[PDB]
Design an enzyme around this catalytic site. Structure first.
Site, PDB file in Angstrom:
ATOM      1  N   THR A 149      50.602  21.185  49.608  1.00 55.74           N
ATOM      2  CA  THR A 149      51.688  22.107  50.003  1.00 55.74           C
ATOM      3  C   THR A 149      52.449  21.584  51.233  1.00 55.74           C
ATOM      4  O   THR A 149      53.700  21.531  51.257  1.00 55.74           O
ATOM      5  CB  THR A 149      51.088  23.499  50.312  1.00 55.74           C
ATOM      6  N   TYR A 158      54.148  30.893  39.514  1.00 52.60           N
ATOM      7  CA  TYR A 158      55.307  31.420  38.756  1.00 52.60           C
ATOM      8  C   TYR A 158      54.965  32.083  37.431  1.00 52.60           C
ATOM      9  O   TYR A 158      55.356  33.254  37.218  1.00 52.60           O
ATOM     10  CB  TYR A 158      56.480  30.398  38.604  1.00 52.60           C
ATOM     11  N   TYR A 180      42.448  25.197  43.986  1.00 47.21           N
ATOM     12  CA  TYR A 180      43.201  25.649  45.142  1.00 47.21           C
ATOM     13  C   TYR A 180      43.828  27.021  44.814  1.00 47.21           C
ATOM     14  O   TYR A 180      44.592  27.133  43.870  1.00 47.21           O
ATOM     15  CB  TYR A 180      44.253  24.573  45.472  1.00 47.21           C
ATOM     16  N   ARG A 188      51.651  32.221  47.392  1.00 48.27           N
ATOM     17  CA  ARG A 188      52.667  31.236  46.972  1.00 48.27           C
ATOM     18  C   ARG A 188      52.846  31.187  45.455  1.00 48.27           C
ATOM     19  O   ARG A 188      53.923  30.904  44.964  1.00 48.27           O
ATOM     20  CB  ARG A 188      52.336  29.849  47.494  1.00 48.27           C
ATOM     21  N   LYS A 209      39.625  25.096  47.646  1.00 50.64           N
ATOM     22  CA  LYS A 209      40.364  25.397  48.859  1.00 50.64           C
ATOM     23  C   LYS A 209      40.800  26.841  48.714  1.00 50.64           C
ATOM     24  O   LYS A 209      41.650  27.183  47.834  1.00 50.64           O
ATOM     25  CB  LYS A 209      41.513  24.397  48.979  1.00 50.64           C
ATOM     26  N   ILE A 231      41.100  22.507  54.853  1.00 44.25           N
ATOM     27  CA  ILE A 231      42.229  21.661  54.591  1.00 44.25           C
ATOM     28  C   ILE A 231      43.325  22.242  55.455  1.00 44.25           C
ATOM     29  O   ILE A 231      43.800  23.344  55.241  1.00 44.25           O
ATOM     30  CB  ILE A 231      42.547  21.546  53.075  1.00 44.25           C
TER      31      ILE A 231
END
Ligand SMILES: [K+]
Ligand SMILES: [K+]
Ligand SMILES: [K+]
Ligand SMILES: [K+]
Ligand SMILES: [K+]
Ligand SMILES: [K+]
Ligand SMILES: [K+]
Ligand SMILES: [K+]
Lengths: 292, 292, 292, 292
Positions: free
Chosen positions: C44, C107, C133, C138, C161, C203
């Protein structure tokens, strides 16, 4: 006294909806025998909302008498009007309770400054130790760490029951307060994680029916034996969740009755009797905990 | 009566936090002259939270006395214990009030079935019309359309003050209830939208200081002249938002004091005095509305 | 390699928006010198969203070459179409990267079963170790612990993560997976609390500019010296928060430039240059961390 | 064209996940016969997420070819990198499409200023009308009314597909933009409310299977016959909700297959086959709409 497994004790009722003395005594002896650290009397789980202040004081005074010096008793003293919070607290001055559990004003949604003023005025009209209580999903109001930091400077404000289930709050608050300010979880499902981050205990709904497991779990946690405390938490985790399958304390009162700990599971409107499907859920979680 | 611009009137207080009768008279005269449909006495904006039931009943009786038949009065009668809700309603039986505004239990978070039993029991023990009041961000509890539809079948449950600001609720409720059930917004910033969707009026904070514009805006909305009502709403919109810049009724009491409609802007703890920055945001909203 | 302070490294760019090799080398040498455990390349923070897959592979391959065997390199390989995730991952088969960081499809909001199928097909077309992840704010999608439990049974799915900042997830996931499944925080502000609950590292965006402090903080945490790790976290907490004052990686790129670690702070649209007020914020947080 | 019932058409696929031209022809014939205003080709419901840009462009060109001038086509052209958004738009210049539906960047969470620069740059490099598309629950980002008002001043930014289901947005946007800016709902369950508030139509999932009822409902809404449009909406409401019982387009593709409008209900990973329980919820919604 202010650490370890603290029970938020149900107010057991007869069928008319009035406190049942015999069931209350059964419950208290059960806590003395099980190792429960302290009793919170007429907190959320004890239906503070449906007891008028006289009823509420009667139950506190009755609980203290039955505890008979064997277990410390903390009184719920929340009110959303500051003058009512002071007046309810004064009923307990020079009483034998060891301290008060006092919730952020609910409904009227004060600012952080109004929270500060409310708790400081309460603390000022008493000698009793005060435990702040934050439970935004019930009150509509969130007492932030910064405000807890300000209030921790008041001599007799000694701790917080943090019921958000937001674990980041343990160390946000610890950073701001002195090392003997007590941090207690108000969220059973996350309370072991809360202690692992540095909290000192839990004011617990689960301790109502699993007092021995809970006391044992908090002792292991306090000694640093987290892998061992977690074995117990996993056995209890169905109860930690399923005791909220219907609005607390509907499931825990039913569980108390099912266990023979109280004579009836009666509550006051707007609390309603457990549904058939809730019974089945709570029964299974009691079985998983090895209690039934 | 149950339609149009209804004011959730402030409880004006002197410096000791007691009801100020002279100020209350001025407010009532202002509403009668300005075309306000009815007055909600001791609702949320009226500081129900910090008046005990006795003071609460005095403010409603004083309001009816001052109103002198010139404008209908609805009493807030909410309580989170069903027995208290019933018993507060009894104080208003035969008083002259035209109905009651009764909030969902706050704090104790009952189920839909408990909300149903709560309002049904209240409605059973009075002849007064009952208006349900949903405001989840204060109470922790959300009265759903389905439950409103069941409660609408009770003869004297006549409408709902819907304060979520969730506008999909208007037609979800409306399709479940008879044509004569009243739908009232409890959210000033979205109240014109609510009316455009089929709601019948607003129980409003803004109307304390913009009574005439609110009344004209709600009459234009009722007749379907939404573009005309929208022009007035655009000029009241900073007020709709800024009367909530600090906890309501702090900004609206300061605003009433700044207009000279009440002698003091005193509130009861845990409500605190307006901040200087709040003063300036509110003054600017008042000026944009053309009120200063 | 998969524990301790892992940096989610910015993709430094020249003024045309293309990778700047000299700034990238500076950054990598800085990490080798500082004790950083591993580099996540084009995650990211490395602007995976604005690099096409060729650009993205070039930056990964360039980073691995510059790392020159001195520090392990993990490739970002997320895609919201499963066939694209497989194809991007295949670019890195037999490459020298030690594993992939692969985000939940964004999305398109798949079910838990679609998440399961997506990651299992990716794992199947590779030998590389896979780190799941989860970053719902997001992606619009939340990979639940139960689903992580299923995926942990796939041979080369080795870790997660977890970027929700929801600390209860550490032990929900640990309960369901084997003891060598790695848990890494994706949320700087809560990452020390995450390790205290039993996570294995982080991370990190903060490690971009405070690599030595971060490496030191994770070593202390891993050794159980939490009070000591926390002294460092407090010095870094303004950066943990202020590096998101504007959308990541706008603040950290500016901080890299301010520190002399990269030549320019250029990003690709829709990321925009840091505002003047953001600069001032990040400058102050850099000062508090003792870095400027 | 930019008004009324616009269908967010499915991309029908064979068993290998390739566009099924025969099925697409059947759907287009159905829309032309049923009165649908326009077709959105390769939007969210069209599986834009899992078609690469080349397949994406083929589906839009195939749609225009099949449509043969009988019904306008709008292409989805969203991308989270501005350069890609621009470059995808170029593929459609002079194609025959009447405009573009361009989503807020997803995943990377730009600021309002970055959204502004993003859409302004896209609009700069085309002559095609642009419709902004806000759907925060997919993208992680919320395009606010204020930013829409700034973007509406760009000649060829002509409207917005507002998919929050937050109905206050209609009049917040409308007061900031000229009378000819089109406001389109992207939320089927609240689309009639949206139109009643001033919106101009809906980009709809339901219209894939209820084209005629949707078209009549939107014409009745445009002429102000809301009570008449509400009767049709009440019969489509289980479909509005149940086409989302599993991730859209899983339920609506199954529904098209069950009606015989497409040969197969195949999707691309990470979308998975409908579950049996989903089949039954959707069949019951289809029957309530009178479609089976
Ligand atoms: K004191
Ligand atoms: K103290
Ligand atoms: K009655
Ligand atoms: K009725
Ligand atoms: K494999
Ligand atoms: K594994
Ligand atoms: K242009
Ligand atoms: K325009």
């Amino acid at each position: 006294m202010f650490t370890g497994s603290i029970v938020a004790i149900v107010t057991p009722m007869d069928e008319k909806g009035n406190v049942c003395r015999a069931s209350l005594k059964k419950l208290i002896d059960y806590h003395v025998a099980s190792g429960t650290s302290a009793i919170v009397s007429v907190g959320t789980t004890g239906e503070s909302a449906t007891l008028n202040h006289d009823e509420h004081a009667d139950v506190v005074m009755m609980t203290l008498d039955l505890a008979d010096g064997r277990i410390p008793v903390i009184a719920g003293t929340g009110a959303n009007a500051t003058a009512e919070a002071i007046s309810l607290t004064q009923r307990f001055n020079d009483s034998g309770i060891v301290g008060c559990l006092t919730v952020t004003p609910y409904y009227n949604r004060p600012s952080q400054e109004g929270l500060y003023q409310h708790f400081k005025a309460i603390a000022e009209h008493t000698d009793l130790p005060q435990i702040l209580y934050n439970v935004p999903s019930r009150t509509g109001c969130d007492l932030l760490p910064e405000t807890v930091g300000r209030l921790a400077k008041v001599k007799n404000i000694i701790g917080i029951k943090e019921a958000t289930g937001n674990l980041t709050r343990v160390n946000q608050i610890k950073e701001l307060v002195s090392d003997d300010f007590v941090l207690l979880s108000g969220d059973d499902a996350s309370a072991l994680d809360f202690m692992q981050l540095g909290g000192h205990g839990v004011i617990s709904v689960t301790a109502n029916v699993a007092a021995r497991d809970m006391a044992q779990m908090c002792k292991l946690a306090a000694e640093g034996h987290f892998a061992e405390a977690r074995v117990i938490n996993q056995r209890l985790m169905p109860l930690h969740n399923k005791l909220f399958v219907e609005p607390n304390p509907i499931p825990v009162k039913w569980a108390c009755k099912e266990l023979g700990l109280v004579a009836t599971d009666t509550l006051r409107l707007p609390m309603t009797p457990i549904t058939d499907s809730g019974r089945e859920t709570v029964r299974a979680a009691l079985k998983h905990a090895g209690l039934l």
